[PDB]
C-alpha cells in the first residue's frame, strides 16, 4: 500500500512538461520502475519516446536500457551481469536493489514449475547466487540433491445477496 502511493506520484509528472521534455532523473525513474513491474512493452516504448539528443547526453539512461535489453530476452544468467556493469548513484540505486530481488524470486518460481530436474550449474545461474545455496538447499528446503551428476529435484509444497440478485433479474 505504501509502495503504491509512490508509484502513481511519478506517473503524471512526465505528462505535464513546459516543453514536452521533463528533467533527466524523471525519465530514468519511469524506465527503471517499468522493469520492476515486468511491463516490457511500455518500457520499450518509453525508450523510443526519449529524444536522441538527451539520450546521448546522459549515459545513465543508457545503463537502464542495457539491463532492460537482457530482461527482454529473458536472459536470466545475463541480467545479473548487466545490473553490475555500471554504477548507479544513490538516487536511483534503491530501485535497482528491488529489481534484482524481483528477478531472483521470478527465477525461483519458474524453476520450481517448469522444471522437474535441473542441473545445479544452470539453476545457480538462474537464481543468481552460485555462492552458498549449494550446501544450504539440501537440508533446509528439503530438495534432494545428487552430486557428480548435479541434478536438483524441485518438489511441490454474503452469498445470499448475490443469489437473490440473479432471481430478481431473471423473474423481471
Amino acid at each position: 500500500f505504501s509502495f503504491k502511493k509512490l508509484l502513481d506520484q511519478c506517473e503524471n509528472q512526465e505528462l505535464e512538461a513546459p516543453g514536452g521534455i521533463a528533467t533527466p532523473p524523471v525519465y530514468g525513474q519511469l524506465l527503471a520502475l517499468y522493469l520492476l513491474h515486468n511491463d516490457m512493452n511500455n518500457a520499450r516504448y518509453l525508450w523510443k519516446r526519449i529524444p536522441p539528443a538527451i539520450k546521448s547526453a546522459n549515459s545513465e539512461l543508457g545503463g537502464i536500457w542495457s539491463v532492460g535489453q537482457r530482461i527482454w530476452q529473458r536472459d536470466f544468467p545475463g541480467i545479473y551481469t548487466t545490473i553490475n556493469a555500471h554504477q548507479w548513484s544513490e538516487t536511483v540505486q534503491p530501485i535497482m536493489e528491488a529489481l534484482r530481488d524481483a528477478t531472483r524470486r521470478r527465477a525461483f518460481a519458474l524453476v520450481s514449475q517448469a522444471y522437474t530436474s535441473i542441473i545445479a550449474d544452470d539453476f545457480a545461474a538462474f537464481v543468481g547466487l552460485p555462492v552458498e545455496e549449494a550446501v544450504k538447499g539440501i537440508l533446509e528446503q528439503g530438495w534432494q540433491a545428487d552430486s557428480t551428476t548435479r541434478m536438483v529435484l524441485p518438489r511441490k509444497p454474503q452469498q445470499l445477496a448475490r443469489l437473490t440478485d440473479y432471481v430478481a433479474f431473471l423473474e423481471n
Binding site: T164, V167, A168, E171
Partner: protein, 109 residues
C-alpha cells in the same frame, strides 16, 4: 340426511368454531346443540394464535351442582392425531410442496 347417503357408518359428534378462549356465546350454542345430541363435543380452532402449539383445542361439557342457579362449564381434552394411509399420503404431499405462490409477490418471497 345428505351425508348419511355417502358416509353410512358415520354419526354426529359435535361442532366447531374459530376464535380465542371459549366465550359465553359458545356456551349458549353448546346448550342449543345439546338438544340435538346428548353429549356433544366442542372443537375450537384459533387462526389468530401467536405461539408454536396447535391452535386446535377440544372441550367437553360438564354440568355443575352449584347452589342456586345451575351453570355448565367446559373441560379441556387431550386429543391424538390418528390418520389413515390415503389421508397421510395426501397431507404429506400437500405439506411437502412449496411451489404455492401466485400474484405480485416474488417466488423468493
Amino acid at each position: 340426511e345428505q351425508f348419511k347417503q355417502v358416509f353410512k357408518e358415520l354419526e354426529f359428534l359435535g361442532w366447531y368454531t374459530t376464535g380465542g378462549p371459549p366465550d359465553p356465546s359458545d356456551i349458549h350454542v353448546h346448550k342449543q346443540v345439546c338438544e340435538i345430541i346428548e353429549s356433544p363435543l366442542f372443537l375450537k380452532l384459533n387462526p389468530m394464535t401467536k405461539h408454536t402449539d396447535l391452535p386446535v383445542s377440544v372441550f367437553e361439557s360438564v354440568i355443575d351442582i352449584i347452589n342456586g342457579e345451575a351453570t355448565m362449564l367446559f373441560a379441556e381434552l387431550t386429543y391424538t392425531l390418528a390418520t389413515e394411509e390415503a389421508e397421510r399420503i395426501g397431507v404429506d404431499h400437500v405439506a411437502r410442496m412449496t411451489a404455492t405462490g401466485s400474484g405480485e409477490n416474488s417466488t423468493v418471497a
